[PDB]
Amino acid sequence: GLFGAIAGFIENGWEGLIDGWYGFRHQNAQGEGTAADYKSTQSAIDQITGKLNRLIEKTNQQFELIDNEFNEVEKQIGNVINWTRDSITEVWSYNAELLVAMENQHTIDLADSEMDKLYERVKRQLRENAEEDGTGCFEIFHKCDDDCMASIRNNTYDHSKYREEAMQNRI
Amino acid sequence: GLFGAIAGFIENGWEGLIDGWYGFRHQNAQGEGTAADYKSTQSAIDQITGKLNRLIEKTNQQFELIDNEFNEVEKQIGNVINWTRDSITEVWSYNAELLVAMENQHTIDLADSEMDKLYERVKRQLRENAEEDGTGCFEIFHKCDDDCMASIRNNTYDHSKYREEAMQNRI
Amino acid sequence: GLFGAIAGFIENGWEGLIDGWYGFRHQNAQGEGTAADYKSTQSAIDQITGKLNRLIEKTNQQFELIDNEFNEVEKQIGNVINWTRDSITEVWSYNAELLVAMENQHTIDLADSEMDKLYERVKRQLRENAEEDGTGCFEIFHKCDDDCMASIRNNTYDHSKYREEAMQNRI
Amino acid sequence: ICLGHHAVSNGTKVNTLTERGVEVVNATETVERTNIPRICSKGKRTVDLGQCGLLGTITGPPQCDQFLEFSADLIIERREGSDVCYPGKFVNEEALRQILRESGGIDKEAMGFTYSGIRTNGATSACRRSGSSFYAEMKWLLSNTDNAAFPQMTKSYKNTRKSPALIVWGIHHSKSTAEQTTLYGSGNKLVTVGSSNYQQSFVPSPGARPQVNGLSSRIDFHWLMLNPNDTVTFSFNGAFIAPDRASFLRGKSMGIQSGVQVDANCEGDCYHSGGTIISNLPFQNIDSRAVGKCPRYVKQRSLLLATGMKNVPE
Amino acid sequence: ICLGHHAVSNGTKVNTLTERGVEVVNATETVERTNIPRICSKGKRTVDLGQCGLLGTITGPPQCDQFLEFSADLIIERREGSDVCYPGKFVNEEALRQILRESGGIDKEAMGFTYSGIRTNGATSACRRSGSSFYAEMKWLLSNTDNAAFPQMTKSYKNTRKSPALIVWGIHHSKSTAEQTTLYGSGNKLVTVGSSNYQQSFVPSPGARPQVNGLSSRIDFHWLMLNPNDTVTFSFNGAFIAPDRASFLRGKSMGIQSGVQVDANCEGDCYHSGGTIISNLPFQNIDSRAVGKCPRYVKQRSLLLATGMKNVPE
Amino acid sequence: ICLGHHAVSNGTKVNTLTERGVEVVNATETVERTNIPRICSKGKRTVDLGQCGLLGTITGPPQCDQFLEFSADLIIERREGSDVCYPGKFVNEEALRQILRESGGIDKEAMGFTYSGIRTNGATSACRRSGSSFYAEMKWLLSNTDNAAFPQMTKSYKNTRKSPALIVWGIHHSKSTAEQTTLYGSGNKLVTVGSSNYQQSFVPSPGARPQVNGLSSRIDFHWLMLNPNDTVTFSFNGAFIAPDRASFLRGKSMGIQSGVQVDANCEGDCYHSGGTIISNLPFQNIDSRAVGKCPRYVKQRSLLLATGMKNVPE
């Protein structure tokens, strides 16, 4: 993808992550746990569904029969009719191929971007209390128990409250 | 948008910002002021105008009358003519819908990206003298008067000159 | 581009860089040297080639003659045939123009993004041992000889090993 | 604390602008390939013409007696349909077929021709109704007795209604010049038809043709649309199969050609000869000649749209 | 110091690939709906045919006398136009109409036919010029006196010019066989026309037709294009409305059909029956049969293109 | 340490969605403009009809004797081709031309007509084979001696094969009624043709036509497709150019019209009158009427696709 997260500096996905598209996997003294972030996941689902809803639109234009399967119409007008229909077919096959290719590129790229926003949001949540390891993890330079991890996930982490210790550990 | 600035970690726009698309709102001891950044704004306007200029291109292909509104032409050839025209119409309605939808996605995404470049440029201007608050603001850890703010805006801020104090305040 | 690297905060490209699309130019006590990064370059080439391979696809639909260059066919059916063909032509000229314009936008944007990933990857390699200058350079706050530069390029740079000195120099 | 995304053990491959066969977590099909092999006609007044040919509903050979004034939203022609009983064919038959498919059905009205000095009860063993009969909406005009002269005559009809009138007449081509005289008397025979926007003349052409239904003689059926308040006038001297009633179009409908059964329990809007395409998908790979409200036909049998992120398992 | 972007109190909603009705700061329309109800003809030599039917400029019924040699870049047909005075119709009329719309006008030249042994001054009360007259470019050939024999005759014309010649002739269908003999003598009558690339025969068909302009007799107008240095030869024995002049196409033009006035103060290039579409927009929702240099017709009445960022007010 | 990207001194300008004439490091053309001026026919059984007109292969004027049973995958018509020797023209000629271009060639078979009481050896100085001759696949039926009566006769042919039969016959229009009687006897002459799906009558039209190949008389060639197990029956009294053999289509082929040489050393699949378009590019700006497997024609002469990053030199 264009944002070099998914299939990028995060080397792979989590097959045990069955409760969301993106999430946090933390480790502290009580061990490790994994939970999904609802807000980021729902944005992607909402954008992809809008894409789907465009494509499942019913088109209310009627076309009627203009040649004949039981009694073939006159040859010349028939060749013009077949030539036109094949020309139109050439056009719609192109449009279908291109549409899906483009839409797939954007869908993949769209999922990649939303991950990066989650990562960067959290990085700015942690401020000066952590450093990025380059694989999607934040090494936390202070003791962070399960309530502390939970506080980053639901955006109640106050960086100042732990500021003295995290800094106290980085130098 | 794809860049999670606009309608993203910056929660909303400024209805009092009537002089540009993007800008700076600073606060220091003399109070707060708001001015627009010309360079970032003009880039977006220039890209959107190019989009507009493509769409207002005049096409120099002539089509002439091939059926008749006063004396209807023969029925069969008329059905072929109407069938073809309706087929072409189906194609151009699709192209128009898709073009505008795609162009609108890219226009929105284009404005989002230019904001992020302005934000990141400034962040790198400030170097180690400030920290991001996660909402688009830079908390400046040194006294920054109106000439100092103006110096960031026109890219004359020398981070070293204030380096000792901003650091002197972050620890 | 959308990522404000290429033609962005990196002011220009290197005409002496004949061995890759992206690369590193370092300076230390032994002088300066320039080498290309293979991994980033090959990704862009691979994506652009896929774009090319789509466009050089052979289409296996046959169209046959339906009017006549030596003995013009009857006028009315001829006007319908010419009208249809000109209509189809209008459609394919639009599709060709739009396809190339869109593909070119994405190709330019694609090259811009891959540069940003290389830059950000390296930034996270260097961790707390360097600061970005805002032009694509990392000022390294420790002595970094040719083996050290080479170690960043092939992703064997251990930030901890030099951690004490780089920090020792930033305060 | 670490950020990540989901993946699964077996994903689905799709194509993009830059790569073919990229694996994503889930995808969905955009091209419809599933056909339901029946004519889904729920909610729609349907007329299955069966052995009645569509053009026959205007002339009324025996197989079409039940369809002389049909009314329908959907018209189904079958391969066994025949427009004729006495062998013959319509001129500009497909145009007339296309007119009748969108008509919504037909309403018949007597055109009011009365005759004197001729027989009007021409019958044939090819149109049998418990005996020799003819097209129910036409009259085979003959001389009163064998070899008697058919008088040159003119019969006119005024469309007193508010929509165009479909008028059909026939030209009889006897098996030989000798047989043609026995029906209408010797000499050149001519039928002229004129309106406010129409003029065309016809002369019968006796001659041997292959036996179809036992007969080597044939009938040419001709037609025109007569505008409201306009008049059609026929001037003829023999070999003329005269119209008894005019036809008027009821409203609107659509016509299909099928070889599959009617199903009043599925509802559909896109038909082809093999059944009904029921789909919300924008494309179909089933039949390029499908009619109705249809997904656009494409040559690809499958175009997978990514509905999830890239799958990167370990 | 804080970074931000603008917003306004009332934005405009647009559609994107992922969302319908996203609010942006400003947007602009891509589909033209505004019609100017006149034929904008500024800068263009315009011919408004009015009561002259376009095909009439070749034959010259009275309503077309001012148009026998017209010259134009833009040709306007009106609903009250008539191609005829003596009732009748052209064969392949629309092809000929389409030829004349792009002709740029016509230049007439005598074809040089001289006659002996017949009358050449056939006139009718349907083509009145202070008295009984006829089509100005044709001659109604008759026998010298009532019931006299029309001699079989052959008249030829060589196109000595450098562009194709438009030749038109007519077939007269009298009100009855008795009336046809009074004009041309009894028996079968035949007109053969041949060139280097054309061959077709015609026999008149007398008979009753509804009275149009008081007459139950009618004229069939036929035409062909004669190549440079090629010859057209007419062999006829009566019922032949002979051409007096050939027509040559002047250059190039375009033809429209309108029911609205001419305006030499607006300039336009896209016309339909209701006026002129003046627009730089790529699409229009006004008339799918517009002609000229036009925005592409689409079924949507509106497609808004975002021209500003997403609007996120507080 | 510093990050950077490459650039070159002279790049190539391309267009994007937001900007025209943006400079990139390298780009490649998507529109093919290069034509190879020959018919690349390597690997394909080719028939260059040359002076033989395509329709002539069915009737067999002298210039087509070598093509009476041709077999081909690619058929090339030339401007000097003629369908005829005795002047005349086919009815629905282009439909027949289009049928023969995709036929793969023709296989002739005697239709088995035998005659008594007439001459069958009609010849003309326009179809010369060391002397006066005629169309090799037809027979010019005449009365036994000058002014003798041509008997009304009926000749039938059954298609005993498994594919449709192409049957062609001709109508002879003599130079005058006097010349027509010398060949076939006086009076109206009629030819009726009927099958299971066809009925049409023909009467000859004697008259003066311009001299083409010295003759003012002409032949109308008519045709029909006879289904397997169906019968065609001809009833005629003169002026009938009878078929001797029926034609059957061999398989499949494609037809082009060219004015350039054959090259068995280049291989191609997209042809126009000026040669062959050999290209992997998706678009071409060479000929909008190209046929075969072709890049889509577009009006742009050039559309450059960026294949490298933006070029930003210093």
Ligand SMILES: CO[C@]1(C(=O)O)C[C@H](O)[C@@H](NC(C)=O)[C@H]([C@H](O)[C@H](O)CO)O1
């Ligand atoms: C040879 O037969 C019959 C038939 O078809 O039943 C006898 C019919 O009475 C006769 N019809 C009339 C109206 O006289 C019919 C007729 O001779 C032919 O059908 C005309 O070709 O033939």
Ligand SMILES: CO[C@]1(C(=O)O)C[C@H](O)[C@@H](NC(C)=O)[C@H]([C@H](O)[C@H](O)CO)O1
């Ligand atoms: C019955 O009338 C008139 C007319 O239409 O004015 C008398 C005309 O003199 C006559 N024209 C000629 C050339 O003799 C014309 C003619 O009889 C009919 O128009 C032919 O059907 O009739």
Ligand SMILES: CO[C@]1(C(=O)O)C[C@H](O)[C@@H](NC(C)=O)[C@H]([C@H](O)[C@H](O)CO)O1
């Ligand atoms: C005037 O000439 C010739 C010719 O064309 O050679 C003499 C031919 O013998 C004759 N053909 C026959 C079959 O009698 C031919 C014929 O009179 C015309 O071609 C018919 O118009 O004329």
Ligand SMILES: *[C@@H]1O[C@H](CO)[C@@H](O)[C@H](O)[C@H]1NC(C)=O
């Ligand atoms: C048109 O296409 C159908 C189906 O592809 C084909 O069978 C038919 O023969 C074609 N029509 C003519 C007149 O060739």
Ligand SMILES: *[C@@H]1O[C@H](CO)[C@@H](O)[C@H](O)[C@H]1NC(C)=O
């Ligand atoms: C073609 O379309 C016009 C306008 O949509 C319609 O009124 C007309 O009847 C159609 N032509 C035929 C021959 O039905």
Ligand SMILES: *[C@@H]1O[C@H](CO)[C@@H](O)[C@H](O)[C@H]1NC(C)=O
């Ligand atoms: C169709 O187009 C060709 C080439 O553009 C042109 O020369 C020809 O005259 C046109 N056909 C008719 C019937 O006008």
Ligand SMILES: *[C@@H]1O[C@H](CO)[C@@H](O)[C@H](O)[C@H]1NC(C)=O
């Ligand atoms: C994946 O694709 C289709 C289309 O969106 C959807 O109906 C299906 O339920 C999805 N399945 C899973 C397991 O996400």
Ligand SMILES: *[C@@H]1O[C@H](CO)[C@@H](O)[C@H](O)[C@H]1NC(C)=O
């Ligand atoms: C037809 O004529 C009648 C009078 O007989 C008139 O009232 C009616 O309005 C006319 N209708 C049309 C469609 O001409």
Ligand SMILES: *[C@@H]1O[C@H](CO)[C@@H](O)[C@H](O)[C@H]1NC(C)=O
């Ligand atoms: C918004 O849209 C149109 C199209 O670009 C433009 O003409 C208009 O002046 C713009 N208005 C504002 C207030 O920006």
Ligand SMILES: *[C@@H]1O[C@H](CO)[C@@H](O)[C@H](O)[C@H]1NC(C)=O
């Ligand atoms: C026509 O013939 C003349 C000689 O009479 C000749 O000079 C001229 O070039 C010819 N033109 C054409 C178009 O055949």
Ligand SMILES: *[C@@H]1O[C@H](CO)[C@@H](O)[C@H](O)[C@H]1NC(C)=O
């Ligand atoms: C640039 O463009 C074409 C198309 O990809 C390629 O064949 C060519 O070799 C490239 N050249 C360079 C110097 O990269």
Ligand SMILES: *[C@@H]1O[C@H](CO)[C@@H](O)[C@H](O)[C@H]1NC(C)=O
């Ligand atoms: C034609 O008739 C023969 C019997 O004479 C039969 O065996 C054959 O199957 C028939 N074929 C067709 C195509 O009707």
